[PDB]
Amino acid sequence: TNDDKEIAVELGNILESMKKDIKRQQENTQKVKTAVSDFKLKLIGGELSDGTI
Amino acid sequence: YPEINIKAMNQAVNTIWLLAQRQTSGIEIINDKVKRISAYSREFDEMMR
Hints:
The structure is cut from a larger assembly and holds chains A and B.
Chain A: H1 11-43
Chain B: H1 6-22, H2 34-48
């Protein structure tokens, strides 16, 4: 079952659906880790995500 | 692989950033000496982690 709550049964379709989903979870996770590190490095200091010290 | 005390290090990274903003030299070239040093050391701790 994908992120979109739809089901996939065949091996040639699951491996392609999982490839979209793992690709979808990384770019969500990078949006998370950016906002975490933006929240940390605004507190402690250093380069933010935009490049602003 | 003998001995690495990052408690002595991640303090020392943080104090360099702490002493960067703290310094009161009143001169314009140490003010971009330390800023270039400290922005390395903060990024050094990040890039090590």
